[PDB]
């Protein structure tokens, strides 16, 4: 059977399973990759928080939070605390274009979790609020 790049539909029954569970039952790792910080929260499919880790909660301060290594460490910490609650497979939902967009996922993988899908949910207004003016540096 040809691999489908598209995620499974909740309604349409599918045979894809991960440790016996359907796609819509897998825990979700929400990564928020800001410009100066990366925050990772693992939640259950029913939206029950299991683990949380940010670059600041891992000891990094000021500019050191906005690096790849800090996001990787936060990912490892989140993956460890999620492993301690029975999480193996995760669906990654990444929001933002910060330096830790990919390093947090790397840290999650090195912490033992298996990523089955990647979703981007970066906020894109259809021209709502007015952004701030450019910096005159």
């Amino acid at each position: 059977t040809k691999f489908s790049i598209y995620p499974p539909i909740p309604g349409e029954e599918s045979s894809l399973r991960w440790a016996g569970k359907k796609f819509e039952e897998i825990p979700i790792a929400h990564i928020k990759a800001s410009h100066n910080n990366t925050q990772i929260q693992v939640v259950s499919a029913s939206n029950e928080p299991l683990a949380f880790a940010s670059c600041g909660t891992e000891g990094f301060r000021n500019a050191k939070k906005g690096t790849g290594i800090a996001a990787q460490t936060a990912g490892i910490a989140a993956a460890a605390r999620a492993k301690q609650k029975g999480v193996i497979h995760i669906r990654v939902v990444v929001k933002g274009l910060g330096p830790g967009r990919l390093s947090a996922m790397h840290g999650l993988i090195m912490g033992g979790l298996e990523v089955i899908s990647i979703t981007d949910n970066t906020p894109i207004p259809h021209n709502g609020c007015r952004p701030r003016k450019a910096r005159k540096l």
């Binding site: 790049i5 598209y6 539909i9 349409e12």
Partner: protein, 96 residues
């Protein structure tokens, strides 16, 4: 002399090219047809350089998509997964 050329319109003139939707009605209720001209992953409407439509039908499709979206017939942020297996008419490849 009878061998002189005569005035006429070009008889070898090939017919003008037509878009795939030429002569067909675009309805905002036909979510299936409108879904063939939006991105599967973002729901963004494809430009004419991708759809290959003429300006009139590009405008018709755009207006129909917006009408269906605001009147609760079509999703905005993605293509309805029920139409993901419909024939591909757009010249775009994600190498997925």
């Amino acid at each position: 002399n009878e061998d002189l050329p005569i005035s006429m319109e070009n008889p070898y003139k090939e017919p003008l090219k037509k878009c795939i939707l030429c002569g067909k009605h675009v309805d905002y209720k036909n979510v299936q047809l409108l879904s063939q001209f939006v991105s599967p992953f973002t729901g963004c409407i494809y430009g004419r350089h991708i759809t290959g439509l003429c300006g009139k039908k590009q405008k018709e499709i755009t207006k129909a998509i917006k009408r269906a979206q605001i009147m609760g017939f079509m999703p905005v942020t993605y293509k309805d997964p029920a139409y993901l297996k419909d024939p591909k008419v757009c010249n775009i490849r994600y190498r997925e």
